[PDB]
């Protein structure tokens, strides 16, 4: 106690349900890590998410290489060496530092994050990271003449890093392009980094720790690696305790084995947060739900596999850090109409609130334990997401084509519900139609 009291106002800004307090269920893993981290007692995510008086009382009971992460995206590059729909693209937009000061805090970062300046080798036991050093990252400068022609250059940019196909054996996997326009305090910078070495978060990251460096202020040491966070899990896969979560969840899942981006209406985002505090889950949860049955009623199925996309920073020392952690687990959705709505999504916020408890598990594992009970692999073919001084913006330019059929991401901007499916299956008019069918039904549901 007074430590619960810290780490909830921490998270939440104020004083202590947590979901209704303003939470959800990332910033309920963020505070039982750091709740972990001191106290050394680890209270599973099911039994708290699923009040301060609460927590307190599970408190009380509760006792004092590359990563498979990386290599799966790595591993994939090498079967398709000229697929360049690995290649991340981000712009940040800076107002308020010279070109001098950019360009020595790109230096600072690159220095400290490992990730952005390694060569990877094939290995007999699996690839082998070298780091670099951070002056082999290319580093262009140019001056534009004025704000349209800094446009022209940073499009022209990102043609270019777009086709690019990294030589990820001898080169740095990471390049920018520093743009700066004459008589303006804005400059443009477009990193373009192989999704081997970096993810989503890390783009916050990198931003965050910009912004800090251009104002002004110092950076911590880093508590981690991503060699170290490869090494904790070679030892955790050595032990056993990922597989047997892995097998666990194969019992379940054994006999299942184009852009569009669209404001989410205010009163489908109301309706999606009504139906979360009623049934005791996330927002996400009611959003997950609806998609699966829609997705579930086009297809003509009455069990659907939804892959969830996941950070994947399990522990605290991991939060900080530049590289790929994201993971991609599954969730069997069983569309059963004898049951109760509420009861469809307690079912669903749990199983998701299992997942992000053991996010450290990866989709191989999963993978394995379903071969080793017969079935050939785990077909996802459908996925759910969620996304003073110096001003820096980063967004991601998003990868063309898709991976995976259909793909739904939320991101808290109102809610923008982003629609990415693979053409030939589901092209523009077909999402719209989901997009449509999906709102309707979170309405119905609510
Ligand atoms: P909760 O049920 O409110 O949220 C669900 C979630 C924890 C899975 C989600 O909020 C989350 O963890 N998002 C992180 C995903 C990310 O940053 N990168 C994925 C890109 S592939």
Redesign the pocket.
Known sequence: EQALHQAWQAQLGAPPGFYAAGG???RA?HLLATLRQRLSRRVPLQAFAGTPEALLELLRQAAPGLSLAERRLWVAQQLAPEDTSYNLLAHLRIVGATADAIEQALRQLLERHVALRRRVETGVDGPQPHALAAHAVPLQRLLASDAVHAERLLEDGVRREGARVFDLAHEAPARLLLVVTRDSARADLLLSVHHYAF???SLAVFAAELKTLLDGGRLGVLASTPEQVAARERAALASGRLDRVAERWAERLLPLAQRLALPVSAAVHAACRALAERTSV????AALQAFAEVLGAELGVDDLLVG????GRSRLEMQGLVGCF?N?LPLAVGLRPEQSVEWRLRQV?HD??EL?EHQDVPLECVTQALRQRGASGLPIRIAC???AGVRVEADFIPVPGARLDLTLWLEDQGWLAVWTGVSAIFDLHRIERLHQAWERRLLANA
């Open positions: 959800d269920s990332l893993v993810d989503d978060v996330s927002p996400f949860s969830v996309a996941l950070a994201v991609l916020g998701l609130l992000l997401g969620a996304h």
